[PDB]
Amino acid sequence: SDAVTIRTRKVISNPLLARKQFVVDVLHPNRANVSKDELREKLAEVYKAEKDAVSVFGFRTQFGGGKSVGFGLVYNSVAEAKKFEPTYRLVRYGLAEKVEKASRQQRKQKKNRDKKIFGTGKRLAKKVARRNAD
Amino acid sequence: PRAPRTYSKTYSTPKRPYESSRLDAELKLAGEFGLKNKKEIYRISFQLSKIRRAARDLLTRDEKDPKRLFEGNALIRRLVRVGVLSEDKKKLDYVLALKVEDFLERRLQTQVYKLGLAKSVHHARVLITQRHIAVGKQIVNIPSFMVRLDSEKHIDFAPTSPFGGARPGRVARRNAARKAEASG
Amino acid sequence: HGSLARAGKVKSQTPKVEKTEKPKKPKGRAYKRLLYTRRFVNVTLVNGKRRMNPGPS
């Protein structure tokens, strides 16, 4: 807000993904670092295009601070933005809801067990129950 | 797996560990240029030997050789970029006889003492190591920076540095606040 | 001779003397500056051979 002076370089528009790509630069003295959501809000309020169509990531701060350089993406529409953006980036932005999956070790263990079990398995469960009953 | 990342040494130990004259020379040089180790002298001597070997291998080739002309032009261009060679003499004697004294007196830490920004070599050294130096819009804390005459118009203190301004300092704020509280 | 003894003789019979408390020495560039000052700019003893430990005569 106080003389951040967000600026953009190497702005190239590709209709192939219907987006515009650039390297963005922020000159923000007396700051820790400019957050990506704050950058998105600034780009939205200065371009009057869209809120969720602006992507900013990377953002290394120069040694001694005061300036940061990162990568920025703007999208033709929110539909295309959600069609092309990575799921992790969308979730980190908050545009997407996080998935509920177990650890990879548990998933691989489960795949091993269900490759050991052939078919549906209900017949095996019923047979085991009857064997216990007898 | 991944391609290896090449790493090279930057210094060389003398062949004789205890030469009285060499030890006196190195200690005097490091005392007058404010160096922390003989490894700095070793590094600068290493690059000096590297460039002298380059010059000798260039003079190896016949006169008016395209590779000789190109490579000599590149080496002299870098030497004048770092600013040691004459801007109007292409006589190459300095090229064949650059000196450790020249390299250190060109190095950054002594540059501050030469231009008069710290008035002491060690005070300079401690200023760079405490990062109150900015060659441009960037802050460097390395004494061995070897400025290239280009930032001379732009040398200043950082705006995120105390005694550069807009900030009292970690102990300055405490001392001023306690003085104000005591004075009432 | 009767010399079936004294394995570790002097190390056992030496007196335990503790290192005296003295101020810390400078480390790094400060130590090198101290050496340079004590070596060159000083004129303590340059008469015969510029010796480094001027023992009492």
Next chain:
Amino acid sequence: GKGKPRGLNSARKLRVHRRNNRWAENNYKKRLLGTAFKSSPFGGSSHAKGIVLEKLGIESKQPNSAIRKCVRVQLIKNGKKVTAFVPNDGCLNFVDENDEVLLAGFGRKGKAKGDIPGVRFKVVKVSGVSLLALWKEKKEKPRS
């Protein structure tokens, strides 16, 4: 003609003569015969662990008269017995019994160092703790 053949086609003669006369060099012969891997006590290795066995009635070289101990050690990988020299003052505290000691060479690539005749190795570690650590009292050998 200075001995050696000089003809432009005498390269085979020169190579064969050099091959024959390389063998007069002490280190080349050892390297090409593998004497380190066949008859060196350490098997061509920098260091070797061992178990200290007993006392032997040996005498030091000039000038002294000292018969207390010099550690006979049985190596683990070879099973060979070598005499090692405990390299510091106060040797008594570390030679208790059946200890495991790490041995290095004396530095002369397989030869005795000084006034100690027939000893080519020294001790650096006693049961995994460094001998000069015990000598300087900065670490303690395992007493429990």
Next chain:
RNA sequence: GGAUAGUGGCCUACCAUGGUUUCAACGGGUAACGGGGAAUAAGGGUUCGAUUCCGGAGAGGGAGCCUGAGAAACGGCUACCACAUCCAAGGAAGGCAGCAGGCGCGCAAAUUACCCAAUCCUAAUUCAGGGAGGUAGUGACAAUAAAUAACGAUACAGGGCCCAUUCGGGUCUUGUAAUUGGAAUGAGUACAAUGUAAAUACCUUAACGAGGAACAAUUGGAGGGCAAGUCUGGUGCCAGCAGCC
């Protein structure tokens, strides 16, 4: 002629002692995978190359094979030797030199974590998977710049220097304090922050954070090679030191 996908003693019938060899054949050894390739020179180069790339080989060793475009495939099958995963004693079934990890072997080498996010792979494939790979832990194998501090009244240890009222003032300013200070910062606790979806490691920030019995630099330790201890105690060819003397 057969077999091969194909030439060919690769094998079958007849015909010679034909083929190699001191220009080193054959045999033996290699603590020998080969090459690209570290360490030096305008040429003496001597070693090493298990190892990031390429070509080989192997999946405990030999042998045999199915499927398959492609395999003599061993995280595919068929047969022993050391070894096993087991009972309720009839069995079923063979070797992590893939990643972690364990035990022996040793002088000698990491965690039984995370992720398909950055790079590539596969037919039915924009969506799946990958211990390939990346990341996170140990790590002083190496490699880069580099914290350990910068100044006042006083004297002392006294470079270059002046005022012709002979240690007075000292212009410029080399260093030291057991008597003392308005000046600059690193290591970390951390909400804030990133190439991480929930994160400690890198510079940024409220706060805590410097006074030297603080947050403390070691390793070799001064005969010669290679400068300096005849300054002080203990032993007295003894303990020991010493790569050589």
